[PDB]
Each structure stands twice: as structure tokens, then as C-alpha cells.
Amino acid sequence: DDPAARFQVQKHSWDGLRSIIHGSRKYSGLIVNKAPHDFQFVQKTDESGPHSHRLYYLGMPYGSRENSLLYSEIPKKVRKEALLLLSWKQMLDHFQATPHHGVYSREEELLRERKRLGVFGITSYDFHSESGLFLFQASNSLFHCRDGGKNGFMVSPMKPLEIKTQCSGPRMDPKICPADPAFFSFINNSDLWVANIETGEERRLTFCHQGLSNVLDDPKSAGVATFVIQEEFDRFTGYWWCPTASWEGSEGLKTLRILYEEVDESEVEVIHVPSPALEERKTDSYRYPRTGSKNPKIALKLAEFQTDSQGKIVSTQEKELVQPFSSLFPKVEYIARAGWTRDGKYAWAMFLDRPQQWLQLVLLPPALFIPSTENEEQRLASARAVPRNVQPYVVYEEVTNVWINVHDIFYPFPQSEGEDELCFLRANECKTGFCHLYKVTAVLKSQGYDWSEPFSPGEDEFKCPIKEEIALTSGEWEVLARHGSKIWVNEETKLVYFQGTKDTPLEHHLYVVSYEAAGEIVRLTTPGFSHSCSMSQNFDMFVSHYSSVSTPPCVHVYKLSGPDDDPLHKQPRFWASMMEAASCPPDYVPPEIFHFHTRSDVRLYGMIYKPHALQPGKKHPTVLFVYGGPQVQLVNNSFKGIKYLRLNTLASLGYAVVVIDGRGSCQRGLRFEGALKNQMGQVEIEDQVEGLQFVAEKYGFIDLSRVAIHGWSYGGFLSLMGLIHKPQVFKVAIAGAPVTVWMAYDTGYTERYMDVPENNQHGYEAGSVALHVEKLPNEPNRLLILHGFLDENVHFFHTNFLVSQLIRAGKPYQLQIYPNERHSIRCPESGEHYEVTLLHFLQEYL
Amino acid sequence: DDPAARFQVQKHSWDGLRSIIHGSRKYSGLIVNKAPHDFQFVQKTDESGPHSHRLYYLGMPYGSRENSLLYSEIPKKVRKEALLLLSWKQMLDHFQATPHHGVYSREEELLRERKRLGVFGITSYDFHSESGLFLFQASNSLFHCRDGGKNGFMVSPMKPLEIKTQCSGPRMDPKICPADPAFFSFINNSDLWVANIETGEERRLTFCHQGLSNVLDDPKSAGVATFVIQEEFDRFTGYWWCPTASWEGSEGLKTLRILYEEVDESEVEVIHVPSPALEERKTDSYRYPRTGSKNPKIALKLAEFQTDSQGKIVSTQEKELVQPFSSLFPKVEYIARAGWTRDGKYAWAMFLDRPQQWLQLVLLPPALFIPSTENEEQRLASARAVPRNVQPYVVYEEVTNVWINVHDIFYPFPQSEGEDELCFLRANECKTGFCHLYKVTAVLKSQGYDWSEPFSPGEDEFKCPIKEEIALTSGEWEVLARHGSKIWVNEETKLVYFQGTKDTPLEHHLYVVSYEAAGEIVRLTTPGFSHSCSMSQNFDMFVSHYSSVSTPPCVHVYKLSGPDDDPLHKQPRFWASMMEAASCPPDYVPPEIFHFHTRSDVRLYGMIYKPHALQPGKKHPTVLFVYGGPQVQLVNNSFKGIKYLRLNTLASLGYAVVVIDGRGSCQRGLRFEGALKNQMGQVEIEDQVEGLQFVAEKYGFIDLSRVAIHGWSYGGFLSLMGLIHKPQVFKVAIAGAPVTVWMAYDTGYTERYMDVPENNQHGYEAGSVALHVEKLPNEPNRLLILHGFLDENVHFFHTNFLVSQLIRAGKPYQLQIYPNERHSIRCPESGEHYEVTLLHFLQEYL
Amino acid sequence: FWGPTGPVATEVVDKEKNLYRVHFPVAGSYRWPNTGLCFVMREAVTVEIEFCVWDQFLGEINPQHSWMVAGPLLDIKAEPGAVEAVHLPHFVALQGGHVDTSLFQMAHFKEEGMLLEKPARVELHHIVLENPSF
Amino acid sequence: SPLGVLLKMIHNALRFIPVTSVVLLYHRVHPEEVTFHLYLIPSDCSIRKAIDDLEMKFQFVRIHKPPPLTPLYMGCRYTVSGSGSGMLEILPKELELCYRSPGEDQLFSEFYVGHLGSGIRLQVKDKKDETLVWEALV
Numbered sequence A, B: 001d002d003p004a005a006r007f008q009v010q011k012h013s014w015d016g017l018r019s020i021i022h023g024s025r026k027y028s029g030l031i032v033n034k035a036p037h038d039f040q041f042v043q044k045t046d047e048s049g050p051h052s053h054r055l056y057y058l059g060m061p062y063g064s065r066e067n068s069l070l071y072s073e074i075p076k077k078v079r080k081e082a083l084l085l086l087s088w089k090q091m092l093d094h095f096q097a098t099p100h101h102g103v104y105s106r107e108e109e110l111l112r113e114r115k116r117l118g119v120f121g122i123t124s125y126d127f128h129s130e131s132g133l134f135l136f137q138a139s140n141s142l143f144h145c146r147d148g149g150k151n152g153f154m155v156s157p158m159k160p161l162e163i164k165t166q167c168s169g170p171r172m173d174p175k176i177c178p179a180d181p182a183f184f185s186f187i188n189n190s191d192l193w194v195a196n197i198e199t200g201e202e203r204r205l206t207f208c209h210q211g212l213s214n215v216l217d218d219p220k221s222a223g224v225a226t227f228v229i230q231e232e233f234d235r236f237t238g239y240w241w242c243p244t245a246s247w248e249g250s251e252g253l254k255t256l257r258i259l260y261e262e263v264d265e266s267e268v269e270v271i272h273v274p275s276p277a278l279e280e281r282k283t284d285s286y287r288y289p290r291t292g293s294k295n296p297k298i299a300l301k302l303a304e305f306q307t308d309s310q311g312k313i314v315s316t317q318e319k320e321l322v323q324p325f326s327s328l329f330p331k332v333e334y335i336a337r338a339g340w341t342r343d344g345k346y347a348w349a350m351f352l353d354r355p356q357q358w359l360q361l362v363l364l365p366p367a368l369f370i371p372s373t374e375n376e377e378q379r380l381a382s383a384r385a386v387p388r389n390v391q392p393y394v395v396y397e398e399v400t401n402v403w404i405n406v407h408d409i410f411y412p413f414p415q416s417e418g419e420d421e422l423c424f425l426r427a428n429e430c431k432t433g434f435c436h437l438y439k440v441t442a443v444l445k446s447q448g449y450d451w452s453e454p455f456s457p458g459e460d461e462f463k464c465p466i467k468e469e470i471a472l473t474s475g476e477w478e479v480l481a482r483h484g485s486k487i488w489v490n491e492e493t494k495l496v497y498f499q500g501t502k503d504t505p506l507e508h509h510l511y512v513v514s515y516e517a518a519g520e521i522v523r524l525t526t527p528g529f530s531h532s533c534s535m536s537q538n539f540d541m542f543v544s545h546y547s548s549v550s551t552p553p554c555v556h557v558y559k560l561s562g563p564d565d566d567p568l569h570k571q572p573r574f575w576a577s578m579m580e581a582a583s584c585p586p587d588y589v590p591p592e593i594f595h596f597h598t599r600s601d602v603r604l605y606g607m608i609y610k611p612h613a614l615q616p617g618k619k620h621p622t623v624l625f626v627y628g629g630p631q632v633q634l635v636n637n638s639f640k641g642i643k644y645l646r647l648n649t650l651a652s653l654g655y656a657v658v659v660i661d662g663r664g665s666c667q668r669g670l671r672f673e674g675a676l677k678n679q680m681g682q683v684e685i686e687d688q689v690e691g692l693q694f695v696a697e698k699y700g701f702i703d704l705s706r707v708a709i710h711g712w713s714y715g716g717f718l719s720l721m722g723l724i725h726k727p728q729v730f731k732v733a734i735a736g737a738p739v740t741v742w743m744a745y746d747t748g749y750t751e752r753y754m755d756v757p758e759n760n761q762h763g764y765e766a767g768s769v770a771l772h773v774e775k776l777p778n779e780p781n782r783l784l785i786l787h788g789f790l791d792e793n794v795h796f797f798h799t800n801f802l803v804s805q806l807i808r809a810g811k812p813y814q815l816q817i818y819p820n821e822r823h824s825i826r827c828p829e830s831g832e833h834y835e836v837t838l839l840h841f842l843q844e845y846l
Numbered sequence C: 001f002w003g004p005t006g007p008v009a010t011e012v013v014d015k016e017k018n019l020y021r022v023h024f025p026v027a028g029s030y031r032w033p034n035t036g037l038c039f040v041m042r043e044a045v046t047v048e049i050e051f052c053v054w055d056q057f058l059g060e061i062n063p064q065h066s067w068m069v070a071g072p073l074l075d076i077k078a079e080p081g082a083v084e085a086v087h088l089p090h091f092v093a094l095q096g097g098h099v100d101t102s103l104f105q106m107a108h109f110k111e112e113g114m115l116l117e118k119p120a121r122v123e124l125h126h127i128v129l130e131n132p133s134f
Numbered sequence D: 001s002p003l004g005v006l007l008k009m010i011h012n013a014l015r016f017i018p019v020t021s022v023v024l025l026y027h028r029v030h031p032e033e034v035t036f037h038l039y040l041i042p043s044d045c046s047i048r049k050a051i052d053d054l055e056m057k058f059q060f061v062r063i064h065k066p067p068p069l070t071p072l073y074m075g076c077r078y079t080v081s082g083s084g085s086g087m088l089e090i091l092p093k094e095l096e097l098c099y100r101s102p103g104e105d106q107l108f109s110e111f112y113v114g115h116l117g118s119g120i121r122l123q124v125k126d127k128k129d130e131t132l133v134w135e136a137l138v
């Protein structure tokens, strides 16, 4: 251990460190442009015009700091040997779609926190193809515009028409009625509303909410996805339009259904979290279901109404299942996803049990929903009225000994070929261990139910027998289904375009396969990069927003082209470019990807940022950045500069930065992710230590006496796990936002991975870092706790209880608060402080 | 600078520092004794026995770890040349009067936090002398006992009789009815109740609280002193028994009045502060009147009832003033104090205005209070029924250009002679600048009021003319009146015994004077110490719990003795001793008191703890401990070891500890205290800097390059003022619980000293450290912010807003949280951690 | 241009919109000395030039930092196909190092957006193209 | 479309590619004192005509002074100095050569000179390594 061959980081003053962090972000405004996404291809059908399509998307042109609706013009033929990069024309007339200083309503701020929307303005919009309707949320109001429906394709921008309201409060979750483009719907004060663009007439549809006081006293909401669904099950809406319109044939009235989820979150614990306006010194109530404690009591419901040909909501009607939801579907804790089949015949839904090891798809035909009234004899009356044939058909039932990941891919096909036998495309990770597509043909044969009396379901009650379940993909790789990935199914060519990890887990590639013959899968994206793709509805061209470890993200428009007789082998030729790779930050050295094997012989991947201007011989101090928990993959072939600029800053000061994807990470299958079940915290840190020890042996510049562990959310929890079970390895531990007590965390995440505490008490206690504070160092300058004070996800309680137990065990700590930051540090000033605090802490104490 | 003539403190490991801090308090079982207090002398008059009196008191012999009722036996004659020390016998039968692990209920824990009761068990009792009834609060119940009324003087301990309840909730604030010992009264769920010891029958008296929800929706309380009154005006009850009983002469019924205060805290801002049970993650609402914002709307009310001779509460009646309180007494923001004259004729009350520069005493005769009804004709009916002559007499009206300190000294005499005047004693600081006693004779001549019709008072409406205002004391020293000091008025000898600072501001001495002929002030306590005294009701002997800077605290019993013809010169002879001045440890070196003059020529006092084992020549680093704000006096001749053991620990490690009483402190008069008026932070730090400089010249061991400023409460606010306007003086600043924003602090304390944010905005902004964060050091390790997370006094918001503005101004900070601690660190583990953190921070960064 | 016929001074139709026109009577041309731009053709025809400004056009394209402006962005309206070479004033880098000639890419704007055609060859202060100069 | 020329600097490395750029100054003859405006700008006639019509509106005129003898790096910080620097009030310490569009006003160094003078030294200097690139004697 020669002390002259151990790299000393240059001790900068605090203002120096600020100068360095600021100097990082001089060129980082140009690196991240919040590039084109949310794409909608529209044809022009002219046969004499210049542009073949119009691409609609969200994007940040150079004049504004804000995300807005734009379009590009995709031509009929490009020239050879010329790179054509499209101009981003503005749809809207350069107005301000964000309130003052980036503030929002409480529902908007919460929804942006669940969606991780760091960018301001028009973040989510809705589009209806034929009428060409753009319904969006701008400022604190709703807006719309249209582009080439019965109208035409504009060239200068048109200002967006404002939709006024009589309702007091913000309007969440706007969706255009597919069946009637004049109609749309939104959430207002935890109730489903419906409106009409042409007449301006609004109309409430559910009446479970009253706006009395805080959520402790008025607990029923409707069409809203609650916290645990939003945060864990990645659903941000709880109402689904029917895509087709039924006609009752009374006089002329056109019915229009909506499936929505009623939730009675009365029996769920309320927690108070500090509000953003610190001066007011008030809190917000939050219906936060702890592990063990009760989740909201859910139910599916039909909100129908009918309309005159002039387009006025004459009638309305709440409808409910003939028996309760809890009784028709016992052991159904969460509605993961729901929607409708395209023809409108059945409303589908993915159910889940409280362990989250039992998922099942169910079809709910609208005649299964009778109306609702308080008089139980009218209820029996329409219970007699419901057709004995009609029932729910459990089409698919995934069961597993590990856990269900919610895969949103369900693509039921048209059923007019012999009108039973539902055919769908279901992603199934539980079968082989890897998320793979299947074509599944179930058999909907009605058993005949006396729906007036109440019966109890059996364990295989409504479960349909399967005709066949052909596997369209198989292997040691997965189909991307979570995180808003999706499949695009051309039913004319019978092909399904999906994204996957087939070449490598480090690169998301667009693949295509046939659902009729499960032949060779064909890759459409270039290898050596990772791609986020989006197909045209006519499937003749797609966009891919792609990147690599070295190159930043670009957004290229490729065009599937070839003989129509063989659609699988249509060659994607580069047509045009949307966004190009922005030139790197100065002094930015990309990380090196590596892999290695664990002593149990499982392949783990990792990154390293080398210390800039390396002198071999010198053993540099090493910051092991980490997350390690599920649903995330840090190490992959894709540009890190955006989210991990600090890792490069560390490298530029001379820190080795190592990042390891331990066991339990996403996109390496279920058995891999499954390693951390009921022993969370125990295997991940062992994989990170082994990754350090491998990189230490492989590369010669890691001083093991100087190792820092650092990460946020799950990363701070592991950083604390590192400092507990490996103090001899980890010199310091900068724990940001840590989960110190699993018993305090929500059901959706923890129960999936750690089980109910009553069952896995050994592993709840073993992996709650707050409970093992006695094993933290008695010496100081080894532990820095960071926490955003308004964190409504990993509540401040976690850091507070940690500091409590550190005090009680007589252990030092440093601590940093971010009073205006929730979970991700969003404010640039606060992020600059966070990073200068990180550099100082490492400078002095590593 | 000399390169090695600057003392370096030995860098101890964290566990070493814990060993030192733990080693400090190993003798705190003896010297932190909770010295006995709340003394009640009772005669025996047996004419054959050995003991002349029995002294009843609270005390903690550490046979059990809780404070309990005890007694001593005062003999008829002690022996000369023998230190007689009384054994502390137990009244109660050794039960634990505190719950497990020192827990408490909801509002009793807050009442202990207002009263600063750091000790457990029985911290307050009520005594009725003729009956001998002792009424006290134990863990979860009310108790009583009696000693030698119709029954006998006990010798063995008797178990305490339990008072059962039908009420659900704790029974706060017990008081025995003076007129009838069978009756007592208490607060239950912010409402006045009344009971009877012999029969057990209870009975509610007010009905302004209904317990619907939290305090945000049920806002009226009765007989409770609210936060700002509790915290700032040092009143912990809002109901006062009448000392005499009137007899209406219907049949036999004995009326018993109570004056109580209704408070309508509906229009006052609610703030949420985290609850003690951090796991449950809910807050508590607090009716916290911000500075600028509205205080509770107050009113005085008479709750009467009558009783049969067997002792049953037959009737009851709420009564209210003939005009509203707000209309009869405009500009009356706060009821500082209230009560009744001893004979029972009038109920007195101290009123106060929103600037708190206008105090006035008022007498409220019970006929001024009509009953209350919703019927405005019954109201007019008894408004006609009220005698036209009777009204309220404003006897005394203190007005000042600085501020009113509430002095609870107002002794009214019997009015049997003449009946058309009132003679009282009154503490008055506003006349000369120093709190001095006066005998004041006002003239209660009725103007004749038509109480059915309304009117507005003028500025001198009910103000009586004064017959005379003789000053019984005068000088550059004051009579102790705040902080629960009091006068004892022997009406047979015409003497008034008071405490004061007449010899020196550093020593509380017991003085006596005649109120008839104010001749000379006779001191009764020994000089060279500071004394807390308490007289017998028979004025023949007192207790003094006294101490000095060097000697530990003792508790001696003195006896007034001499010729009866001249009672003023009765010589105090030491009779017996209860508790003695313990072993001052060789680890503990007492501080040296000094004084000096400022460049403006005002004498400031200060202490210094010298660095242990001093080597002259060496310049040691210096911790300037501070408070500096009003109502406190750190520097005086009295034992500091108990509350300031950490200052000696610092000294024993080698830190110079300097403590200075800057301008604006208590017990040096109004002009001295008023130095920092409308400008807090601007004058105090200047006095501390000048004192530190004075100390450096006077003593040769202070390294000015290494100065730490450390304080709690107001002390942390000054530590931040030191680091803002004097960074070149103060190297570091350990700010504990600081007031970073005056605009957020309560009315009672801030408005008194700073007028309001609207009028004095320049001075609110100038002395709010969170608005001057840009002037804090850009370098790190100079500022450590400490805060108890549940602080209901100086809320966590203050530290949060400071950290917010540090982040926004790009300034470092260290931070320490005490999650289970409020304003002060009550827990010993948390105090041990806190002290260790202080030693480490000074060790490394000073 | 100041070619074989001497100075054919450009007539200015509007100073504020920076439009120019020439009629150049003989074959070839010589560089106009304001910056050195030169277009050569065989025969006497009218042509107008606009000196377009990037700021509206590079507001459309977002990594406008990723391309450095070398010159004036001139638009030409002559008849198509009768122009045979256009020379645009490239700022000199071949005198220094680390700047490649296979690298260079030509900005040909349209209503469709930016077309990055490859220039034919680079001179010391010039890029030359072929006949289809639009 | 519009035709033109632009150079793309290679993505991986920031080459700091040199430009033909020319710095120019403007005089006042008429008013009570004389202000120089040093335009450190790329050598493009469109940029030249933009500064031309702005200074014609501002009643400044340029005098032909010699340009730099060698190409100089775009984007690098350039201190501006001279013989009169410190007795005459140069406005910025550092200037920037980086390109801006002709529509907006170009970044400049203002230099109040007082008397017009027979001949005056000016200086611009590379902050990377302090090598001379330019000098002009009025």
C-alpha cells in the first residue's frame, strides 16, 4: 500500500466546485433537447402533393424552453446522398402553455411526479386520427386543434382553441371519444366528466365525490388511478372509452360507454406530507397504503350516456356488475390494466392478487353491467333482465412462484370468424422466465349463470379453456412490455412489431415476427445502438429515437420498403432524420461497458467511467454508483450523459466510477430478477462488491481503501447496505432518499418483492437498514444522508427514522435536505448544490 | 501569527468523545437533583409535640426515578453547632406516578413543553390548607389526600385516593374550590368540568367544544390558555375559582363562581407539525397565530353553579358580560392574567393591546355578567335587571413606548373600610424603567351605565382616578415579577416580602419592606449567592433554594426571628437544611464572572470558563455560547453545572467558553431590554463581539482566528447573525433551533419586540437570517444547523427555509436533526449525541 | 461580376432585404471581391441572388450548435440547368490541421427541410459544386 | 430553395476549427468625443453589411486596417488590450469570436478613446497560450 501511488483528488474550494458543476452544464443545455416523442403518423392521400406523411410529436424548438406540439413533413421521395433532417414546424402560435415559474396544480404536480415528467409544458396529448383532433392540457386548462380531418393541412401555425369550463378545479386526463370525435372526457375533482367540443356542453357522469374536506372524509374517487397503481403498476388513468358506439334503437340515440374504476380508499391509512408552499406550514393528506395495510377497494363500472344527432347528452347512466366486484372476483387486489376490444364487444381487464403472483385477463361484456339504484328490487329486476348466456370470460391466467410483472401487451383480434374463440397477443414472462409474445386462442363457451341470486366463484370458475398458445418468440431475451413499451400489430400483413433484447440485453431493438407462422424474427434497427421506436398506423415507416454509450440520442425516420408479397423482409431504409447527435460535452469521456461472471456463474454487466487523464500506476478512489433494484437497468448501450453527467464530472476530477447491474435488475428475465425475492438488500450489495473486485483486478486504478457507494431511491438503501455489511469495502456512503424501513413502504412495490410483513418478517427486518444502525460505523465522515423533504414516494419518515435510530445507537451522520424537492432533484439550483455537496464530501472524506 | 503558540485541541475519535460526554454526566445523579420546590408550610398546634410545622413539597430522592410528594418536620427548636439535615419522607405509597419510558398524553406533553418540565411524575400539585386536601395528577388519573383537617397528621405514608371519571380523555388543570373543599374543577377536552370528592359526581360547565374532528373544525375552547398565552404570556390556566361563596337565599343553595376565558380560535391559522409517533406518519394541527395574522378572539365569562348542603350540583349556569367583550374592551388582544380579589367582590384581569405597549387592570363584578341565552329578549331583560351603578373599574393603566412585560404581581387588599376605593400592590416597570412595587389607591366611583343599549368606550372610559401611587422600591434594579416570582404580603405586620436584584443583577435576594411607610429595604438572604425563596403563610419562616457560580445548589430553611414590635427588622436565622450543596467535582471548574463597559458606556456582565490546565502564552479556540434574547439571563451568580455542563466539558477539552449578557436581556430594566427593539439581531451580536474582544484583552488565551458562536433558540438565530455580519470574527457557527424568519414566529413574542411585518418591514427583513443567506460563508465547515423535528415552538420550517435559501444561494451547510425532540433535547441519548456532534464539529472545523 | 467585361456593378433593388441581380454577358466569371463568391456559366442570362439569413431556418433545426456557419447562405434564382459551377466562400482551415475534406457537407435548404448534400471539392477558400445548383 | 455553406465539426472531438475572421473598428468625427467599436466577427459580407447598415444608422464609419496574418480559433476567449488600455476605458476584459446571425446586433468591445490621436496601438490576445494573432496601428 504505497501512499505515493494512490491518486489524490485536487481539493477544490466550494466556489471552485460550483464553478466545475456549472462548467459541466454550460454545454448540457444543447445535449438534451427533450427530443421528439409521442409520434402520430398521418397520411395526406393526395397522389400529387409533395409530402407523403405528416409526423406529429412533442418537442422543444430553440426559441422556447418548453415542450410543445409540433409536426414534420415526410416527403414522397428524398434525394440520394443527401441527409435530410426535418424542420420542426409549430402547430401552435408560440403561446405560453406553462404557469408562472413552472408551478402547477397539486394533481398536475403529483401526476408529473408519477410520470417522472421533468420537462414543462405540453407533456401528454391525445389525438384522434380521422377527424385529426389534438386534445391537450396547456396551462391549467384544456385546449384542442385539428389538422386535416374534414379541414386541411396548415403551413403557418394556428392558435389552439380553448375549451372553457363551468367546473371549479383542474381538468385531468383528457381523452377523445373514438366513436364520436365531437365528444371527449376528463377527470374533474376525482369524478369522470364528459364534454363536447362543438357545443361546449359538459356533463358529470359519476357522483361518488363531493369536495367536502381532505381525503380523510370524502374517500370515493372515480376514473382516477390511485398512488400505488400510479407509482407501482404504471397506470395514470382509470377510465377507458369504448371505441365504438352502440345504438339503442329507442328513437335515434347513440350510446357511448366508458369503463371506469371506482375506488373506495376509506380503509386506507392517511399520511401527512409537507406541501410545496413551505410558508403555509400545512401538509397534504395522502392515502398511502402501507405493506400489510389495506389497499383501496376497487370495482369496475360502466358510465353510459346517449346522444341526439345534434350531439347533446340527453340521458346518462351509471352501471355496475350484477354482483359486487369483490364477490364476482375475489382475491383481486389490483386492476393493473383495462380497456376494450376494438369492435366494442368486451371490456378487458388485467386483475392481480395481493401477493402479485396471480394475474388474469377477464372480458366484461357491457350487458353484464346492469344499472345501479339504491332500491334492491329494481336491482333484482335488471338482474332478471341480464341474459343468462352473458358472463365474464377469464381468457388468460398467469400464475407464478416469483412475481407478476405487469405487461400491458394484450392485443385481442377481431372475432367475426366464428363469433366465439377470442384470439389475442399476450406477453407472458411467467411461462419460460422471459417476457415473450404469444398468440393465444381461448374458447368462450358460456356456462349459464342465474345472475339474480348470489353465487360464489370457484378457483377455476370463469376460466376458459385454451384452444392454443403458440409462442411467437422464445429465448434468453425479452420483449419490452413495461415502461410504456408496446407492440404494433399490422393485421393486413399479419405481422407484429415489438421491441426487445434479442441481440443483447444492453440494446433495445425493433423486431418483427408473424403471428400466423411464428417464423424468424427480423430486426429492423441498426445494431450497435439502442432504440426507442414507434410505428406508423399504416406500417410503412417508423421513427426510432436511438443512442449508444458513445453517441447521444438522435431521432431517425426509417421506411419499411420492399415487395408487398413478403412483408416480413421489407428492408428499413433510412428516409429522414428528426434530431441529430448533439456534439458531446467538453471533457466527456464515455463509459466502458464490460461484463463478468459471478461465483455462481451468472453474467452481470457493468459500466466504468475512467479517471480523466489517467496515469497508470496510480490507484484512484472509486465511486460505486448504484441503483440495483428492479425495474431499472443502468448499464446498457445508450447515452448516459443526460441523467449521469455527474458520473462523468466525478471521472473528470479523477474518480473511478463503477456501475453494476446486480441480480434483480430489469430485462434479464424473471429468474434473474427473482434472485432478490424475500431477501432484498442481501444479494445486490454482494453483486456490487464482486463487480468492484472484478474491476479492481481487471483495471489497475482502483484503491479499495477508498470506495464510496452512492445512489438514490433504492441506491441510498443499498449504499446503507454497503456501509453495514461491507464497511471494510466501502469507505463512505452517500445515501440519497433511502428506503430505511420496508414496513413503511407501499404494497404494490414491496409485496411483489418482499411479501406481506406478517409472512416474511425475517427479511423485512434483515433488509430494513434503519433497524441495523448498530452495524454502521462509529467513526464519522463515512455516511452522508440526502433527502428531499417533500418526498411523497420515499417519505422523509425513512430518513427521519434512520436519523432517529442513528441517534439512539450513538452514531454520527452528515445530512442534507432538499426542502423544495420531492424525489428526483428537479430544480437546477438544488441539483447543482447536490452535486457540489457530493464532490465536497468525496474530496474531503473519501 | 506564531506558528505553535495556538492551542490545538486533541482530536478524539467519535467513541472517545462519547466516552467523555458520558463521563461528564456520571455524577448527574447527585448534582442534577431536581432540588425540592413548591413548598407549603402547615401548622400543627399540638402544644405538646416536637415539631412546629410540616413542610409539604415536591422532591426526588432518587430512591425512585420520579418526582413525588414528600414532607419534612420543622421542629420547635434545633441544637446549636449541628448541621441538621432532614430526611425526606414520602407522603405517597411509592407508586410510579409516570408511565412507561416517560411517555405522556396529548396535551399534557405540550403543557410540560410550555412549562419546561424536564422531570417526571408529579410536577405540579394543588393544595387546600384548611382541609389539607392535596390534589395532583399522576400518570393517567387524578388523586387526592388529606393531612390533619378533621382527620390527623400522618406518620407512615398513606396511599392516594383515586378520583374516578365518566369522562373520556385526560383531566387537565385540577384546582380545588377554596370556598368548598368538597368541590374541585378540571379541564376535560377543552371544556371546564367540576366535581365533588366525597360523592364522586361530576358535571360539565361549558359547552363550546364538541369533539367532532381535529381542531380545524371545532374551534372554541374554555378554561384553557392557548399556545401564545402559554408560550408568551406564561399562563397555563384560563379558569379561576372564586375564593368565597355567595348565598342566593332561595332555600339554602351555596353559589360558587368561576371566571373563565372563552377563546374563539377559528380565524387563526392552522399549521401542521409532525406527531411524536413517527411511524404513524400523521401530523397535529396547531392553532398557531403567525406574526401579522389574527390571534384568538377572547372573552371572559362566569361559570356558576349552586349546591345543596349535602353537596350536589343542583343548578348550573354559563354567564356572559352585558355587552360583548370585544365591544366593552376594544383594543384588548390578550388577557395576560386574571383572578379574583380575596373577599370575592371583583374578578380582576390584565388586558393588553396588539403592540403590547398598553396594559390595564380591570375589575369585573359578577353582576356585570348576565346569564346567556339565544333569546335577545331574555338578554335585554337581564340587561335591564343589572344595577345601573355597577360597571367595570379600570384601576391601573400601564402605557409604554418600549413594551409591556407581563408582571403577575397585583395584590389587592380588603375593602371593608370605606368600600368606595381599592388599595392594591402592583409591579410597574414602565414608570422608571425598572420593575418596582407600588401601593396604589384608586377610586371606584360609578358613572352610571345604561347596560341595555350599547356604546363604545373612549380611551379613558372606565379608567378610575388614582388616589395615590406610593413607590415602595426605587433604584437601578428591579423587583422579580416574571418567571413565576411573587410577593408575600403579611397584612398583620403590613410587610411585603419580595425578591429582587437590589444588591446586584447577578443575585436574586429576598427583600422586605413595609407598604405603609416605605422606609428601608431589608435584605433577608445571605449575599454572595442567588436565592429562590418561598414564605410560610404565617410569615414566620421561609425556604431558600440558593446557589452561587462556584458552589452547587443548596436548599436551606431560614426563620424570621426577633422582637415582635418591629417586624421589618426580624432577623433571619438558619434553622435547618433540607438539601445541601453537593460535591462540586474536580472535573468541574466553575466559571468566572466579569463585567465590562461598552463604547456607549453600558455595563454588560459575562462569564468565562477557562481552558482546563491552562498554559499561559497559548491562544486557545473559543466557543462563545449565547442566547442574547429577552426574558433570559445566562450570566448571574448561580450554579451553572446543571444546565450548562457541556460548557464545562468544552472547557475541560481546552475551549475557552465565553457567555455574555448583551443588551436586550432580562432583569436589567426596560431601557436595557429595549435596546434591541424593532431591530433584533443588530445590537446583540455587536455586544457579543465587543465582549469577546474585551475578554481577549482581559484574558490572554483567546485565539480570535478560531471563534465559534453557538446557541439554541434565539442563540441559534444570533449564531447565524454572527456568521452573517461578523464572519471575520466567528470562524464557525453552531446554530441550534434557530428563528430564521421572524415573519413566521408567533404574535406574542415577535410583536412585543418587533411591531408587525406591515409597520416594521425594514427590521423584519434586516433581522431575518434566511433573507441574508448570500452573506453567509461560501466556504464549508463553518455552519452547522441543528433542529428538533417536532419543534412546536420554533418550527422546523425555520431550518427548512434556511436550508432552502442556502441551496438557492449556493452555500454549504451541515445539518443535524432530532426527530423525537421538540424545542429542547429532552432525551439523554439525544443530548449525548448532540454534545458529541458539537465536540466533533469544533474539534475538526474550528 | 468583375470578369472579362470588367466591373458589372450589381444593381440593388432593396437594401433592406439584401436582394441583388446581375446580367453577365460573357462566358466564365471572376470572384466578386466582397467575400469571393463566384458562379461560372457559358452564356449571357439574367440571374438574381438573395443573401438569406440562417436565423429563421436554423431555428427550425435544433442542434444548430452542431453545425458551424461557414458563409453567407446565398439563394439563386436563375433558370435551372444553365448554371454550371457555384463557389461559396469557405472559411480557411486547410492551412491548419485536423479538418477533413471527405467530411464536408453542404446545406441545401428546401421547404422540406435541410438537405446535406456532399460538396464536390473544396478549394482554399471555396467549395465547388456541379451543374444542379438550384 | 436556399443554398449555402456550413461546416459540421466532428461529433467526438471539439476541434475549435479556425476561421478567416476579421475584426473591425468604427470612428466618430462629428460628436464631442470619439468611441471605437471593435467587432470581433466572422469575415462574411452579410455580417459586414449588417454591421454596415447598423453603423450607418448610428453614424459610425469604418477605416480599412490590416487584418490578422493567420487563422484564429473560433470560440476561444480573447482578451482585448492596447497602449491606451487602463487610461482609456475598454468595456470588456474578454471578447468572443463565435458566430451570430446578421439579424441581431453582433457582440462587440466598446472603447471610448477621447482624442482621435495620430496613431494608437491595439491588441487582442489568446487566453489559451498568450500568442499574438493581431495588431493594427490605428
Ligand SMILES: *[B]([O])([O])[C]1[C][C][C]N1C(=O)[C]([N])[C]([C])[C]
Binding pocket: A231, A232, A629, A631, A712, A713, A714, A715, A739, A749, A793, A794
Ligand atoms: B425508489 O426506488 O424510487 C422507490 C423505493 C422502492 C421502489 N420505489 C419507487 O419509487 C417505485 N414504487 C418503483 C416503481 C421504482
Ligand SMILES: *[B]([O])([O])[C]1[C][C][C]N1C(=O)[C]([N])[C]([C])[C]
Binding pocket: B231, B232, B629, B631, B712, B713, B714, B715, B739, B749, B793, B794
Ligand atoms: B427560543 O428563544 O426559546 C424561542 C424563539 C424566540 C422566543 N422563544 C421561545 O421559546 C419563547 N416564546 C420565549 C418566551 C423565550
